[PDB]
């Protein structure tokens, strides 16, 4: 599929918590990394629109794209950087303890794999636990 914002919007409405669903969308986003900025914009908008019980899966997709992008270049890391902290704060406010434990694990993975520098990791931790 060629890239369009509307096609991405439709894929995000269909995203589920399965390994195949997150991975398949992520691979498309990495293929279309030239468009990482509008990807992040659409991603954020649809995260905020999504029902509480689907919000963690948005952050899982962000995890997959950012991590799988590292071998390609800094662009996805940089373009998620300005919204990722408020994304964590949002999901944290919108979900329960159980979901927060899942979010915390993503953060621990990010710390151990140096997905972001400590400045951003410290902001993510404050967003979850402050």
């Amino acid at each position: 599929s060629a890239f369009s914002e509307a096609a991405l919007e439709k894929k995000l409405s269909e995203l589920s918590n399965s390994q195949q669903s997150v991975q398949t969308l992520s691979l498309w986003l990495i293929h279309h990394r030239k468009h990482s900025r509008p990807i992040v914009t659409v991603w954020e908008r649809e995260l905020r629109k999504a029902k509480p019980n689907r919000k963690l899966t948005f952050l899982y997709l962000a995890n997959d794209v950012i991590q799988n992008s590292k071998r390609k270049g800094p662009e996805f890391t940089k373009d998620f950087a300005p919204v990722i902290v408020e994304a964590f704060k949002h999901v944290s406010s919108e979900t329960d303890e159980s979901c927060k434990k899942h979010l915390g694990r993503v953060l621990s993975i990010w710390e151990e794999r140096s997905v972001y520098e400590n400045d951003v990791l410290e902001q993510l931790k404050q967003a979850l636990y402050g």
Partner: peptide, 11 residues
């Protein structure tokens, strides 16, 4: 089969 956030190839 549910998503695993450790699944991406790294670190």
């Amino acid at each position: 089969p549910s998503y695993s956030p450790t699944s991406p190839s790294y670190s």
